[PDB]
């Protein structure tokens, strides 16, 4: 819509207060004109029609329970935009300031979130195993990162390229989580998963085996479930990324940590310059090694740590 | 689980099923939904 750029206030899924950028024209809309061509958040109203209605509020106060998923979808989309802009000089997911659209209250009892090629969508969860998924900044950034990947490498969502696609989303989801710097960790989706279990998550990057995901190439899943294991084999890459940043010893192989910023720089360059739709795990290794070489030089700690991390997870 | 209504099965898989009404735009193997 066209109106006056305003700042509203509300409460997110986890009960935290935050300010949100809105647009006033008769109603206050969840339309943030401060970032690129806009961040727009919609109500799917328990149905599956997308995008649904641009979120309209009478008073610019978003403190109702029903408002909470919208507050967080809108806010966290903004954080993710800022991350790509400020850290990687990338303007929205297409690098050309594409509008970022998100819909909440998708369907009923819907235990997932997605990118559909055009927008982000968040279920509310069944309330027992998930709460509304936009409550997790890592989850939001993971979905928008799928859009980034689409527009850059085009990693086909199947088999190894698809697991790389997934790991890229978990890597940058996590780096956006750290960038916001509230309660960051190397777990995925902890803030919206099993509200009656503390300490767990959907996936772990630090220890993928905690939830049955492989942490070494020798344990890769080669069947057909989950698009050839895209959310399973991502563990192998996630563990490599974790080791690159944090260091550690994994099946007896030590890796020197080079930190999150250098991890993000190496992987962003890999994704935008060296990966293609058919890239496999060995090709991702080559891409990350070449990226680190471009950025830091062949003799660098950074190059060596990328090699050691991929060795530690059995990717040659 | 169970999925015993006939010609169906359980999996933790992709977002799209085969639905008569939607086959023209999406199906199990041509699914635009990326989780």
């Amino acid at each position: 819509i066209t109106g006056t750029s305003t700042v509203g206030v509300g409460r997110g899924v986890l009960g935290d207060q935050k300010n949100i950028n809105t647009t006033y024209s008769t109603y206050y809309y969840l339309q943030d004109n401060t970032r690129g061509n806009g961040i727009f958040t919609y109500d799917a109203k328990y149905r599956t029609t997308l995008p649904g209605s641009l979120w309209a509020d009478a008073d610019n106060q978003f403190f109702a329970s029903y408002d909470a998923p919208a507050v967080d979808a809108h806010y966290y989309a903004g954080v993710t935009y800022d991350y790509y802009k400020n850290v990687h000089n990338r303007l929205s997911y297409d690098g050309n300031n594409a509008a970022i659209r998100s819909s909440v209250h998708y369907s009923q009892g819907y235990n997932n979130a997605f990118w559909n090629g055009s927008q982000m969508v968040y279920g509310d969860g069944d309330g027992q195993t998930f709460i509304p998924l936009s409550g997790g900044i890592d989850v939001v950034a993971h979905e928008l990162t799928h859009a980034v990947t689409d527009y850059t490498a085009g990693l086909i969502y199947q088999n190894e390229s698809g697991a790389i696609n997934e790991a890229i989303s978990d890597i940058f989801g996590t780096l956006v989580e750290f960038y916001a710097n509230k309660n960051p960790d190397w777990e995925i989706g902890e803030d919206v998963y099993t509200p009656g279990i503390s300490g767990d998550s959907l996936r772990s990057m630090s220890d993928p085996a905690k939830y049955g995901d492989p942490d070494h190439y020798s344990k890769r899943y080669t069947g057909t479930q989950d698009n050839g294991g895209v959310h399973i084999n991502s563990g192998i890459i996630n563990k490599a990324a974790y080791l690159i940043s944090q260091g550690g010893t994994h099946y007896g192989v030590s890796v020197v940590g080079i930190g999150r910023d250098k991890l993000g720089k190496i992987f962003y360059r890999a994704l935008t310059q060296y990966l293609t739709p058919t890239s496999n795990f060995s090709q991702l290794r080559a891409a990350a090694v070449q990226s680190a070489t471009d950025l830091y030089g062949s003799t660098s700690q950074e190059v060596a740590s990328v090699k050691q991390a991929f060795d530690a997870v059995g990717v040659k | 689980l169970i999925c015993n209504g006939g010609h169906e099965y359980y999996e933790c898989g992709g977002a799209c099923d085969n639905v008569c009404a939607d086959l023209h735009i999406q199906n199990k193997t041509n699914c635009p939904i990326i989780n």
Binding site: I188 | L1, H7, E11, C12, G13, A15, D17, N18, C20
Partner: peptide, 30 residues
């Protein structure tokens, strides 16, 4: 963010209005 715990129709089959998986050859126009 993760896989979907779902019932799927077998290849060759698709959900009718009733939600039953039937042969795709028995689907209607739309």
């Amino acid at each position: 963010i993760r896989c979907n715990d779902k019932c799927y129709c077998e290849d060759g089959y698709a959900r009718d209005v009733n939600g039953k998986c039937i042969p795709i050859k028995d689907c209607p126009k739309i």
